[PDB]
Amino acid sequence: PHMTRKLFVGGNWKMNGSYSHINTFFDTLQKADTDPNADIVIGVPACYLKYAQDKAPKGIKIAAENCYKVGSGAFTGEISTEMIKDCGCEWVILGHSERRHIFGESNELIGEKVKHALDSGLNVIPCIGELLSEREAGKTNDVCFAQMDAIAKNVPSKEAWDKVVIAYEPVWAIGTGKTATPAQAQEVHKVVRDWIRKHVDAGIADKVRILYGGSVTASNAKDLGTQPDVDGFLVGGASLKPDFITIINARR
Amino acid sequence: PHMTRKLFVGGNWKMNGSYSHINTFFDTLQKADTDPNADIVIGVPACYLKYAQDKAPKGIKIAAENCYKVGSGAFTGEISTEMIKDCGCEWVILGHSERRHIFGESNELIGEKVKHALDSGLNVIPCIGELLSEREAGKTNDVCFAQMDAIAKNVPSKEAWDKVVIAYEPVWAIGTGKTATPAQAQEVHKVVRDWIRKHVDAGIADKVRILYGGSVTASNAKDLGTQPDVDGFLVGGASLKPDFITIINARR
Ligand code: NA
Ligand code: NA
């Protein structure tokens, strides 16, 4: 169903976390039996990048939740690609709905960040997804296509897609409990994969992981994950809880 | 000239720094003879907060370069007041010109952040200052007054002003080499101090430190610092260099 696409389970702690929580959470994670064929990446606040990557069990990668679009400079409050690598980390989440819709990051800025992160040797999780008002207007695909256009035109090469994991999160499902049904997720992922097939490359479309995110839980992950164009999850609230282990083991 | 107001020397590394630079810089800082009657606070990228505060010599405080306006939650890419304290830090720079004019943070948002930081037990360095276009339009005081209004109405009590250090940085002086003259800095600081005297309290106006920032260097700091309403500096580019030591020792 998912061809040669390996399961990917992302977490995003958003603006939560502490040294105490990191110690406990990753002790539980190390003790637990997790699917050895899942890629696991957890986004954490920037002040915890190195500590959490040191404390993470082998195989688990830590992501920055954002970064800026140049290597260094006069950008108070920003985190650079080089600081992420200095902290021992290789992943960054880009274009999350909260950056776009609370902090006003544009498609152009997120595209610029995708290119700079890829050109710095980072792996990226670019986020796409539509507002409730956009879906009601019949613009779900239009919005996702414009977001994918900005991302895709900024992936510097065909090889670079090996370092890209797309996450689709309908904004109305993020933090609301109103999870997309397996049908709703599959429909959008198929449309996005077809877009990548047509506008980028058919080989790459077949290989690129596309995550569903937006109120993924331990009980709903299995049915979302068995959809053929859903390759895994980007988990918010539940990635702070032991439930994240169950979600990791959903395709097991 | 500066009454009972103690010298305050702030640094802002902006989007620069690394574990290697922190080690070297703070070895030089520990070895150097710094004015023992100066408060010294250095803003660093969030991924380095704990490390830099552990490595800083005694007496030197580390600041976050930004924070959000609530304690925790679904705010991808944000740093909270509680994470700053978890990293052993007590200071945050708020409303820096780069946040206002590159990342679109409004007066209302910066006011909300001042109140939340103060209500979390943090010390704050709220930043004010006018664009070149605003000074040419004759609006320098107007802009500073509106920014001070948002800050002042969000300082929860009279005691809380003990945890506030205002920094005035004309945007045209930040990173440009076009330092405000001692005259230009003194004129604005006097106007701002008078504003605090009239709109807040005369006691507080007498005690609150007001920093000048914007292309402060080792050679120009002395004359800026001897101005009676200039209580110290907020230093950008030069706080990455050994010159920061000379600036710290300018009022010596
Ligand atoms: Na580790
Ligand atoms: Na220390």
Author numbering:
A (entry chain A), B (entry chain A): -1 to 250
The paper states:
Helminth parasites are causal agents of diseases prevalent in humans. or TIM-barrel fold composed of 8 alternate β-strand and α-helices. three invariable catalytic residues (Lys, His, and Glu). enzymatic activity, leading to the concept that TPIs are obligated dimers.
helminths, we solved the crystal structures of TPIs from T. 2-PGA at 2.1 and 2.3 Å, respectively. in the presence of 2-PGA (TsTPI and SmTPI) and in its absence (OvTPI). measured the melting point of TsTPI and SmTPI. and TsTPI exhibit a Tm of 75 and 57 ºC, respectively. illustrates the positions of residues TsTPI-S213 and SmTPI-S215. the middle of the SXD/E insert, whereas TsTPI harbors a lysine. stabilize the SXD/E insert in SmTPI and TsTPI. TsTPI and SmTPI harbor 6 cysteine residues in their primary sequence.
